[PDB]
Amino acid sequence: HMALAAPPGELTLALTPDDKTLDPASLDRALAILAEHGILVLTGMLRTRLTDQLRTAMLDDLPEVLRQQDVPTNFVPGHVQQDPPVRESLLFPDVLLNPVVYQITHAVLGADARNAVYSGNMNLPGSHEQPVHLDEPHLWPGISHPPYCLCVDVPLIDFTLENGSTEYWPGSHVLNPDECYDERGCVLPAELERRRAVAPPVRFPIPVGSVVIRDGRLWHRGVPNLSAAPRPLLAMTHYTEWFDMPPIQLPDTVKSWVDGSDRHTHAHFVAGDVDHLDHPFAV
Amino acid sequence: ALAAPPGELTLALTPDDKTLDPASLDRALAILAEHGILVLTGMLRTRLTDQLRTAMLDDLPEVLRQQDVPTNFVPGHVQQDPPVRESLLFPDVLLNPVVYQITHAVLGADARNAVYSGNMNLPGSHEQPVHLDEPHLWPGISHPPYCLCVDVPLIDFTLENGSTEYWPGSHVLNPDECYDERGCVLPAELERRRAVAPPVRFPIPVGSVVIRDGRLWHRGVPNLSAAPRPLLAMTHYTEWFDMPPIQLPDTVKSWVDGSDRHTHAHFVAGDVDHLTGDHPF
Numbered sequence: 001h002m003a004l005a006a007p008p009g010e011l012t013l014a015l016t017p018d019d020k021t022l023d024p025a026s027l028d029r030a031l032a033i034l035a036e037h038g039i040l041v042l043t044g045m046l047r048t049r050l051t052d053q054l055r056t057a058m059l060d061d062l063p064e065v066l067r068q069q070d071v072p073t074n075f076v077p078g079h080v081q082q083d084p085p086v087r088e089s090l091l092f093p094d095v096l097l098n099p100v101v102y103q104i105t106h107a108v109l110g111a112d113a114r115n116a117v118y119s120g121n122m123n124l125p126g127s128h129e130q131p132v133h134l135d136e137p138h139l140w141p142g143i144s145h146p147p148y149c150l151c152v153d154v155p156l157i158d159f160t161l162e163n164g165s166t167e168y169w170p171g172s173h174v175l176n177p178d179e180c181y182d183e184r185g186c187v188l189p190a191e192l193e194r195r196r197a198v199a200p201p202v203r204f205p206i207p208v209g210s211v212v213i214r215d216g217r218l219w220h221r222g223v224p225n226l227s228a229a230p231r232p233l234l235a236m237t238h239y240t241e242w243f244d245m246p247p248i249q250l251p252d253t254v255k256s257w258v259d260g261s262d263r264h265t266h267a268h269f270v271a272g273d274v275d276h277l278d279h280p281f282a283v
Numbered sequence: 284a285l286a287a288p289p290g291e292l293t294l295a296l297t298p299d300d301k302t303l304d305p306a307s308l309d310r311a312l313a314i315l316a317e318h319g320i321l322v323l324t325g326m327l328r329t330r331l332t333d334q335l336r337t338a339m340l341d342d343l344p345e346v347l348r349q350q351d352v353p354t355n356f357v358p359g360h361v362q363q364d365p366p367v368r369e370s371l372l373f374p375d376v377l378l379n380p381v382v383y384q385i386t387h388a389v390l391g392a393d394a395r396n397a398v399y400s401g402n403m404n405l406p407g408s409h410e411q412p413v414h415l416d417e418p419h420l421w422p423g424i425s426h427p428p429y430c431l432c433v434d435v436p437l438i439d440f441t442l443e444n445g446s447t448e449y450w451p452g453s454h455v456l457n458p459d460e461c462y463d464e465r466g467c468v469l470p471a472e473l474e475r476r477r478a479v480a481p482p483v484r485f486p487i488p489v490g491s492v493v494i495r496d497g498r499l500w501h502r503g504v505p506n507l508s509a510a511p512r513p514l515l516a517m518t519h520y521t522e523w524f525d526m527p528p529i530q531l532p533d534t535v536k537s538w539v540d541g542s543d544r545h546t547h548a549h550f551v552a553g554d555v556d557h558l559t560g561d562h563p564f
């Protein structure tokens with residue numbers, strides 16, 4: 001792997017939280033980066049007011065998560081599946097219904113594209129190396145097809161090479177040779193080494209306030225958090241209208257602003273509070 | 284306009300044929316890949332097709348009595364679901380082993396039926412526009428099948444009584460600006476294709492099953508006979524294509540839910556209203 005000191009210029013668009021919309025040139029560069037590299041880093045998108053509250057809420061919940069009988073874990077120890085709270089006080093339009101994110105996902109997936117994931121990845125101190133995998137598979141084996149899902153990753157602290165910044169395989173989102181992927185979405189080692197010689201993977205720091213948009217088929221892995229603090233990531237995934245997904249459970253206290261929107265959510269609205277803490281998204 | 288299903292699209296079976304030998308299966312898949320439509324004659328016993336025909340003709344008054352009659356594009360092409368009473372749900376229709384052999388090979392072992400509907404073509408019906416029933420998943424992109432329509436004629440289909448018009452090889456066409464919001468083929472693309480590969484209509488004997496790519500161009504045509512022409516329709520989809528479930532009574536849950544021939548089904552206590560969809564839960 002290549003270990004960098006900052007998000008690479010070729011993958012990165014610098015914004016402020018005042019940027020409500022990408023100008024045509026910025027939008028074209030964003031789509032060109034997603035098409036070629038399968039991953040786009042957008043710095044300076046979210047106010048620290050929002051990331052502070054989500055960070056606090058997830059670190060506060062983590063004891064109750066680790067106290068459960070069977071801790072939902074992705075592939076290897078230390079990579080915990082943890083939903084952020086879905087209390088009305090912690091559901092922010094600028095996170096769920098971000099105008100820049102939906103401008104990008106509308107242009108790639110269509111105006112009918114919808115968020116169907118409001119989850120998270122808590123990377124614990126002493127975590128192991130995940131196998132390289134994709135989060136969502138190609139729809140047929142041996143076939144080239146365009147994207148149908150875009151993962152939207154929101155770091156809730158500064159990500160470093162020390163504390164488990166995700167490893168990404170740029171351009172891997174279009175690879176779909178026969179016999180490449182097992183039932184867990186893990187990449188066959190023979191294909192890993194072939195690809196490594198043409199386009200090796202990258203790990204880079206990502207400052208909090210950033211949003212990472214990537215093809216859901218991009219090869220990546222969680223890596224060891226060698227720090228003394230848990231590394232929280234909030235995770236969302238936009239899908240085409242026609243991809244079967246269970247709905248996100250949300251309280252009907254947010255139905256007024258979620259259900260109205262031209263930024264679609266596959267949501268089921270519940271009277272009272274949802275129990276956000278046996279997870280369907282843990283592999 | 285032919286006298287019988289063309290040999291190039293057709294496999295002749297008996298109702299005893301539980302499973303195709305590898306060579307027959309390969310020919311079936313080669314026909315679906317190239318032409319997008321496969322006619323399987325002699326698949327269903329007249330015992331089963333008689334009961335479904337009777338049940339649908341008996342229900343048609345309740346359909347025609349509604350304030351707005353659900354109609355496909357033009358007059359005479361009525362949408363009518365067959366009954367989902369336990370006495371009229373047949374494994375050899377819902378869970379046909381030959382159909383699922385073919386749909387498993389094209390769509391995967393996780394492919395599932397998500398449609399149990401029908402098309403009642405009335406005497407004096409109009410010409411439908413050429414359309415597809417299920418669209419391509421992206422505009423301007425070539426991709427493999429994700430759904431297979433399974434059409435079961437409930438009487439002999441003839442050129443006179445509205446045997447469906449099919450456009451062989453049309454299932455792979457997805458150029459930009461080809462399809463309107465109703466899945467109708469834009470006229471300029473219709474005529475371009477007509478010059479390369481014109482459509483076909485042929486009689487189909489009752490007992491037959493037609494399997495076609497859900498993207499195949501086709502149209503309902505006038506029924507110029509004295510009797511309504513009932514068709515029972517099912518559609519197999521990949522596991523990952525979002526569809527509402529078929530409402531079924533839990534009296535069939537034992538044999539439907541067990542099966543390695545998947546159905547996207549919701550099982551209900553008591554009877555389903557198949558015409559209005561207007562049962563309480």
Ligand SMILES: NC[C@H]1O[C@H](O[C@H]2[C@H](O)[C@@H](O)[C@H](N)C[C@@H]2N)[C@H](N)[C@@H](O)[C@@H]1O
Binds near residue numbers: 121235282
């Ligand atoms: N990037 C978002 C999430 O992606 C993966 O989960 C997928 C999971 O891999 C899929 O099989 C499932 N259909 C959806 C689920 N969201 C990962 N396994 C999750 O840990 C991660 O939070």
Ligand SMILES: NC[C@H]1O[C@H](O[C@H]2[C@H](O)[C@@H](O)[C@H](N)C[C@@H]2N)[C@H](N)[C@@H](O)[C@@H]1O
Binds near residue numbers: 402415416417432517
């Ligand atoms: N071939 C099966 C059926 O195909 C069409 O209906 C489709 C319809 O065209 C699709 O948009 C929808 N997603 C499913 C629905 N079953 C037709 N409109 C129906 O009349 C017919 O019974």
Ligand SMILES: O=C(O)CNC(=O)C(=O)O
Binds near residue numbers: 123130164165
């Ligand atoms: O959380 C991370 O950095 C990476 N995690 C995953 O890719 C996962 O758990 O599927």
Ligand SMILES: O=C(O)CNC(=O)C(=O)O
Binds near residue numbers: 411514
């Ligand atoms: O019933 C027929 O012959 C054809 N009908 C249709 O294709 C339809 O209504 O979608």
Ligand code: NI
Binds near residue numbers: 133220
């Ligand atoms: Ni992952």
Ligand code: NI
Binds near residue numbers: 415416
């Ligand atoms: Ni049709």
